[PDB]
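Example complex used in Figure S2.
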Amino acid sequence: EAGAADRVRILSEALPYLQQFAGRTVVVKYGGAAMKQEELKEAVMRDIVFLACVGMRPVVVHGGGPEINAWLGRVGIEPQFHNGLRVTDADTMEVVEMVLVGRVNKDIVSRINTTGGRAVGFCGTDGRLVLARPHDQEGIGFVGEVNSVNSEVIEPLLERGYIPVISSVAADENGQSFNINADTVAGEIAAALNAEKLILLTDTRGILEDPKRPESLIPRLNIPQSRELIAQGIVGGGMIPKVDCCIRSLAQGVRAAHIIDGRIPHALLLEIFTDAGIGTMIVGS
Amino acid sequence: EAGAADRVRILSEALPYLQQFAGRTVVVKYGGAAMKQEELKEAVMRDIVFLACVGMRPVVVHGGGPEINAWLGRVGIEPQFHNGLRVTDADTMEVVEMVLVGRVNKDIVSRINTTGGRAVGFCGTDGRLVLARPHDQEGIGFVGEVNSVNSEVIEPLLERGYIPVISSVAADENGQSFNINADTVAGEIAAALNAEKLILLTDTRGILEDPKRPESLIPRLNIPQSRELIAQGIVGGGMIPKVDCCIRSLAQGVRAAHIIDGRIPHALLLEIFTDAGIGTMIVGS
Amino acid sequence: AGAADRVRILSEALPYLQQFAGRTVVVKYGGAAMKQEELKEAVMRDIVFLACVGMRPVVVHGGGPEINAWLGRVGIEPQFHNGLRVTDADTMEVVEMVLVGRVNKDIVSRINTTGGRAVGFCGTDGRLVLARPHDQEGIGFVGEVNSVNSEVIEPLLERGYIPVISSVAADENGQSFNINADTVAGEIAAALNAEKLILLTDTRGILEDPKRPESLIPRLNIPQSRELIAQGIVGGGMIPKVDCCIRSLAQGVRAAHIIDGRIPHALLLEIFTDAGIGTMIVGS
Amino acid sequence: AGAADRVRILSEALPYLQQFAGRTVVVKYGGAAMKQEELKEAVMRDIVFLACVGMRPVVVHGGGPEINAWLGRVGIEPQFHNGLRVTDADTMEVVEMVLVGRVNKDIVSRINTTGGRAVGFCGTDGRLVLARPHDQEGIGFVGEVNSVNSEVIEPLLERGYIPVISSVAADENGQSFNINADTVAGEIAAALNAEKLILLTDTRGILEDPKRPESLIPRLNIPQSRELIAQGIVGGGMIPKVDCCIRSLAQGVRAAHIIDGRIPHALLLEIFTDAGIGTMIVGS
Amino acid sequence: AGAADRVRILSEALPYLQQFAGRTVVVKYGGAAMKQEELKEAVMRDIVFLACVGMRPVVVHGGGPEINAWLGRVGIEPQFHNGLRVTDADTMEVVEMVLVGRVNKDIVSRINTTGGRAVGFCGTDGRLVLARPHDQEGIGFVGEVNSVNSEVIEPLLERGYIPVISSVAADENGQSFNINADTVAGEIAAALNAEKLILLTDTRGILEDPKRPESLIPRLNIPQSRELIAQGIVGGGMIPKVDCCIRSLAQGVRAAHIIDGRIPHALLLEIFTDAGIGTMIVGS
Amino acid sequence: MKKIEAIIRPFKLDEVKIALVNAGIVGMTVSEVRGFGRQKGQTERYRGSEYTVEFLQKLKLEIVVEDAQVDTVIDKIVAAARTGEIGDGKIFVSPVDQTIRIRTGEKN
Amino acid sequence: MKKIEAIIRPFKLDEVKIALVNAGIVGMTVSEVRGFGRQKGQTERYRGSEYTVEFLQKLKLEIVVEDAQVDTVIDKIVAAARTGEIGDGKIFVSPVDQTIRIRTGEKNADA
Amino acid sequence: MKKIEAIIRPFKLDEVKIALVNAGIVGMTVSEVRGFGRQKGQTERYRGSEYTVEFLQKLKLEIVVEDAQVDTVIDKIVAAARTGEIGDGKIFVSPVDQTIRIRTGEKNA
Amino acid sequence: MKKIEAIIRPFKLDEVKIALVNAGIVGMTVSEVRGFGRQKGQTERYRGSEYTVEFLQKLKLEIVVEDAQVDTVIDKIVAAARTGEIGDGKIFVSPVDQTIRIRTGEKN
Ligand SMILES: CC(=O)N[C@@H](CCC(=O)O)C(=O)O
Ligand SMILES: CC(=O)N[C@@H](CCC(=O)O)C(=O)O
Ligand SMILES: CC(=O)N[C@@H](CCC(=O)O)C(=O)O
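Predicted assembly (1858 residues):
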């Protein structure tokens, strides 16, 4: 030889992908599986900072239902969800904000910073990044929908090589806070930033052609092909709003939406720099 | 005449002050009295946004002990303070962050935004704005001291006419959060920004030459004159750390430190644009 | 436990301050607010205040009465033909000397001492305004605005300077022309895409009834202005003044104000107060 | 449920990627890694990878063997005098044609096709390098670096271009000079205040014992380098190569690397791997 | 009371100096003005003068005769197939070495010593010009301009540098191609949106009647030019030169000049003098 | 009444404008447009580069003309706007029902 | 004759200058300097941040003074230049042989 | 008491600072300086270029040291600050009468 | 041994430098400095403006010279560095104990 690890050869092989998405913006929905498990949580940060380091522009958007659930059961309030959204009154809202903006957001920022990136944490209400309206759904309390996105706040930082981490909590024109779905915010942030990729981390290996068959994973599908599945029932459960999100986001200008298996270590890298299937990519066709 | 409100005449009289502090940076410690009372809270926001509007650069730094106290008594934890700092273990820290970063910070941001400014909310851990170390005081848990301030994050926004609102919570080099005293953060932020004024809102009419005499209010005193009072006992209680803060901040480059009576409506404006005494100004002499 | 509440009042200016934040305002400083010291001194303060706050104020000025003086000191007689001054080659020379030399540098001088940074101009400076002979036959070297180039003053405006422009411009040949002050203001305002063109004048605005000093119209659009005019209500040398506004508003300007320059701080009263000091004419 | 983990490995490059993020690297592409295709093609990929990541790579090159070819095709004989080539007026003309024309535009060509944006230069381009006659007497038009002006290439470097500079420079008169490749690299690196000067070479580095191909020193400072030299350990044409590094390091450069260009991807192995491929000489 | 009143004649250049102030000029330096020293040295001084004044001059060059020399020194015969030079893989290598290596850096060298800052290029530098195989079948590696990317040179152009580009470009694969000099000049000029494309040539321009100088046409437009080809008046190669101009003018260029490079300071004669040295093709 | 639309090479605009004013035309409008039309399989030239199918910068030029003028005003345009090189543009003629000046009210 | 060198905190320059002119000093020069003279194991605060061993921005201030003035001129400086906080600076006194004013030629030495 | 002034190569500052703190030095100041010391007609290099008589960027480094430490303190500096290449710099030693700490008042006459 | 310090007007630096090299001086250092010294109550002129007490931009110039040279090398400086106008600068002379070249070790 005369030497041991390389390593280098495998690195040189990343070059085409590195070129392919050079200088591009990537909005990732960090949640659930890759958020609870340390091995996975620590892996995501290291992917995010790597992306940033290389010269891509990564943006983390996050929720944290399970994280909320904990603290609510520590003020003597009960979890309740209405076929999608979390039914949030004035008292439970206060807890959502405190957890998502205060405890979770700064954890993600904290980790990235120690990993060697420069994370800057936000929520919708910061410089009116996201402005909320009451969600169309009646009776589910202070659940919000994205009324507008203003990125005049975060693209300055994005240029300067910072990593924005945005929680899915936004204030209305009056000042009342709203619990918005994490995925939609990610989609809407991605749309506003004209992102190359919207990547949703999730506890599913993607979209299966047969739910019974774990290896029927569809690699790609455009909008009509996706809209189809929703009618044929193949795309069901809470894949439905997720797939809705992608379509809604892709329609707005986004070039690609990825529903990846966040359950596996370094899920992000395997999507960006590897041909290996970890989820379904949905394009605008 | 032929007309009613003016108003204009009194406005034209603000011109010399408007010129005097034109383009200057002002770090304000929004806390306690002006924070609890609505009439006063709403007034501060309207002062802050006015300052911003005119072309000065206002920065809000905030704490919220009383605000914390509430939520701690809602998870079944008890308030305790050690002759200054709030004795904060790992469990109580979690609550401090959630309240200050999540609930309080976004309230201030929310208000400013609705008042017509563009507030952007931060805590120390955001882009390593403030980096914490364990406070010299042993045994008081995760109480922090400012180890470094990096403003590379917020002066971009400051130029762009945004209003930074910073909570006094910072992470160490490892990622653990620290409850830092609000005043010191204000002082250290002010020092790092080379601020013209560090203004501390407080429940006292300033520094009295006689504590028994409410109208002995000293208008100005330099560093030696202040250091003196600490030895003569005139400056006592928790005026002491406040006065310490000003000195420490003034030493670093800050041109003026103001200990104002935050108890009265529009306390800020009365200091900046009026000759009327609302507190003691401490200079660097 | 304290005395002067200039605070509660200044907090009340905030909505207006936000409303015109960063906007450009072209003011025609003339006549009433120009002769009387108490008012002249008031205008400068208003102008510098506007500048200070972060708005972009531009002073455009003439000075007929001011010229009248010096003419009668070289032995030449004032001579006006339907609004504009009959200015031959000899009288032009004086106009230029008075407006550019004596008046312009008085306004600049005052602003500077008031704490602004005024920069004085006339049309011919970097071809800011380029003049043509006014359509009107036989009234000598009276000019009309042929073109406005703001490439000169925009730079200074960004840098927070206060341009003060006299209404005198040279043609393509080098000949100086006495142009009406109002029109220049209107044209400058149009070229700068100004939010407001404010004409100081010796009238409480446009009265719906001349006999009643109280009819004061508050707000007018172009058709409503043109009308009358036709109905005779707007008459005298309000007519060219109203023409100016319309001509200026048509070009892009958002609002034109004909305010009563006769009262102290007329400007800040229009900008920051709901109190009526003149008629606002919109394009709306 | 998947196959290629080029992921776990690339995540392991992160610390090095952060370590030299935005830094400038001047590489002397020559000899071994220049003749052999498998290696030549490898270097280009390394160079473009570095550029892609956000580091600033600069290729400096010579090509003695390459020149040797064409000389023997005009009927001129290769002629070396203690390291440097004895180059008269006729042989100079060929050097210039080969290095600037044929070699430089091969390296640029490859990088471009690899997906970088290479821009090829020689000293005389915008006076990037200005030559003087080399101190050595009688070896014809052999040059030494008199001055380096990077005002030319800095702009391109910021714009993410990859400068490729041949080691040929004109004097103040217009006469071309054959300058040693290494020195130019060292000088370019010094002028650019480069983090690393990396010399590709046909030696596994600097051996503490020539008889043992395993003594390989990892790290050296200036005094330790100079020593020996004196002890004879560093000999041959390692000596000018080590001289170069010292001369370059003295000027501001942080690190100089003499690596084994004979092995595939020699560059990325030095930058992103702990594996020893050559001796690092510091100023430290 | 003195002597050289060259001032009066300098003041007379002012209108022309104003007329192309800040404009870009692409000159094809070739043949006559390239071989004869008196002419060669004159061009450089014109080029640097243009640059100095504030215009943006770009030199594009070939060098057939120059290539011819070195070919006959590796033992290969020159051969031409109506206009383009048939070039195999072996002859290409020489073309590249001569034009990029020896000629380009002669022009750069001279300009630099004359006091300009020349920066020498060929097509393949930052993909400035990207070549495709020329439509003509069987002519070997003769190229046609497939694309021009000026993202490389317009930075340098603003910084007051003088680009000198040889007419040799690589394809998407890395193969070098011998492209006609004129066309490159034309396409560079088009890509730069140049005010003038000036072709130096061994002809007094385009003669109305060849019989029969000087009937040199001062100005033509495209239709007029196109017709002359059909009427046979424009013949030889002239034809491709006139083609070039038309093709270049069509793309945006405002003026194309075919001027008599045979006479000293041919360039300044065209730019700053009313004196006829060639045919100007517009435009209309 | 008819609407002539001329998609023309950017630089020519002046030559066309003057030709039309000389031909006595009152009201034109120009807009910035990208276009393409290539053979029969051919390549157009734009800023030095060869293009096949991609959009290139051009200028849409709109006048409205009395029915009888149509023939010779196309003649006037083509003459002014032609280089004879690939991508000179196309002219489109469509019907117009009514023409209202806004400043007066004059309908044609 | 003596050369007083005062390494002082940037902002103080005016207060010191004023104090010296009032004390009646003609000659003065300032230069921008980075320094550190810290007590272990404690830190100095600078633009909000804590520093141990790294160089921080200060100001070297040079006046040449008649031997008798030295004592009370230092008194004047320290009074003006002190905050009492870590990193106020240090004063250095050295001998000066000759003082030449360039525009005139007035050499000074005593006695 | 003595004042050591070291005009040193810009990059070396850290290596010298280190060496002095290790040697136990408490107070220290740096300033940015241009210099030159004509080595018998020879040229000094700076950012790739050869220079003869022109000023080049260096660093003046000022410490005040107790009389006995002078000898081996210079030894520590030179060791740390030397490249052996033309233009390594010069050390200058001068007398110091008094040393006053401003924060406290601690004089040293 | 002695240390000459010359605080001189910015532009003069070249005239002084050459004068000293001609006088045969080996090692100089320059630093950028602000200074002031005014009468007797006077005003110095700097970039068109009159100044009384404020600091103005100058240049400190440091050489170390053998004791015997001192007299005539001040003569050489003043000659080169004088304009005769208010604020030409001052020269300061101090003792030097030791001079160490770092590249060799030569002590003087
Ligand atoms: C033509 C004309 O009336 N010019 C004005 C000058 C500007 C003004 O209106 O004040 C004049 O009275 O001379
Ligand atoms: C003088 C000299 O040896 N020049 C080298 C050119 C550059 C190189 O070292 O490769 C040569 O061999 O000609
Ligand atoms: C194809 C062709 O004519 N090549 C030319 C180069 C162009 C020039 O030198 O002007 C040749 O002589 O090879």
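The interface with chain D takes residues 2-16, 18-19, 22, 43, 46-47, 49-50, 53-55, 116, 205, 215, 265-266, 269-270, 273-278 of chain A (CB under 8 Å). Residues 1-285 of chain A form a domain with the Carbamate kinase fold (CATH 3.40.1160.10).
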